[PDB]
Assembly symmetry: C2
Homo-oligomer: 87 residues x 2
């Protein structure tokens, strides 16, 4: 059995609701998997669920405040581009 | 300082690249935050980053295989709708 869901929560799914989901899955003996962001995890393992990461197409906002803020932003920009992650 | 990035990696950003990012941030004394999915975390804390969760608009695919698979899918469907998470 396989079913596709669209996430509708403004908050998305964080640790608290992901914990409730994970514990619903754990009530059952079948193998339950959740597939997202190119990864398939065990729905009974919250460490699995919390390891899906940030998806392609995400907009993220980084802020740096402090004495080496310019050096910080430049390093972080360079890492995101070097590693082919974000731009 | 604030900058917005779009994530371009097919894989998105998982634990391995998020670990490299997190360690780039840690090299610096400024306060570095990452804002995503309605949450602002410390970019120096990988537990923070791995706690951003699944975003609004995500398509997730759940599979259940086993002796109580029908009971499993129905429980999981009911939880996702009850909690106003996914449909």
């Amino acid at each position: 059995a396989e079913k596709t869901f669209k996430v509708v929560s403004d908050s998305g799914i964080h640790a608290r609701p992901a914990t409730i989901l994970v514990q619903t899955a754990s009530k059952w003996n079948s193998e339950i998997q959740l597939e997202y962001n190119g990864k398939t995890v065990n729905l009974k393992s919250i460490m699995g669920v919390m390891s899906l990461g940030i998806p392609k197409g995400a907009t993220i906002k980084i802020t740096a405040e402090g004495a080496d803020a310019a050096e910080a932003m430049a390093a972080l920009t360079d890492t995101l581009a070097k590693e082919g992650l974000a731009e």
